[PDB]
């Protein structure tokens, strides 16, 4: 999985979208696997986390911060912040201005990485991107 090759142009496209100020606080939801096979969850998420940190100078909400915030919210420790409600409530508790969603779908050897940037304030999807994950 060339996560990088798939993820850098998307992060780049998102950085150029109006409404995305860089250097702001961003909640990076971890990559959701909807392929027909097992994918290394956090291998992707970390590549993502690095792509977003380096490019566009984004302040990412940290893993520990995420953990403690879900606890303070009463959510399960392994809870994924998949539902928007749970994602803003978490986002508000931390300092986040944007929640980033991302999913890998289709065939386990030809996934379609999709991506949406949610404006925490209003909950509107202001940007969306999709790109194949090559090898």
From Swiss-Prot:
The keyword Signal applies. Keywords: Cell outer membrane, Cell shape, Lipoprotein, Membrane, Palmitate, Peptidoglycan synthesis, Signal. It comes from the Bacteria. It is found in: Cell outer membrane. One of its GO terms (biological process) is regulation of cell shape. It is a lipid-anchor. One of its GO terms (molecular function) is enzyme regulator activity. The keyword Lipoprotein applies. GO terms for cellular component: periplasmic side of cell outer membrane. Regulator of peptidoglycan synthesis that is essential for the function of penicillin-binding protein 1B (PBP1b). Belongs to the LpoB family. Interacts with PBP1b. This is Penicillin-binding protein activator LpoB. The lineage of its organism: Bacteria, Pseudomonadati, Pseudomonadota, Gammaproteobacteria, Enterobacterales. The chain holds residues 77 to 211 of 212 of the full protein.
């Amino acid at each position: 999985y060339d996560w990088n090759g798939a993820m850098q142009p998307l992060v780049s496209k998102m950085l150029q979208a109006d409404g995305v100020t860089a250097g702001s606080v961003l909640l990076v939801d971890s990559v959701n696997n909807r392929t027909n096979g097992s994918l290394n969850a956090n291998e992707a998420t970390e590549t993502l986390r690095n792509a977003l940190a380096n490019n566009g100078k984004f302040t990412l909400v940290s893993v520990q911060q995420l953990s403690m915030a879900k606890q303070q919210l009463g959510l399960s420790p392994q809870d994924s912040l998949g539902t928007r409600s749970k994602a803003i409530g978490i986002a508000r508790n931390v300092g986040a201005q944007y929640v980033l969603y991302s999913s890998a779908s289709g065939n386990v050897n030809a996934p379609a990485l999709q991506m949406q940037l949610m404006l925490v304030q209003t909950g509107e999807i202001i940007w969306s991107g999709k790109g194949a994950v090559q090898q």
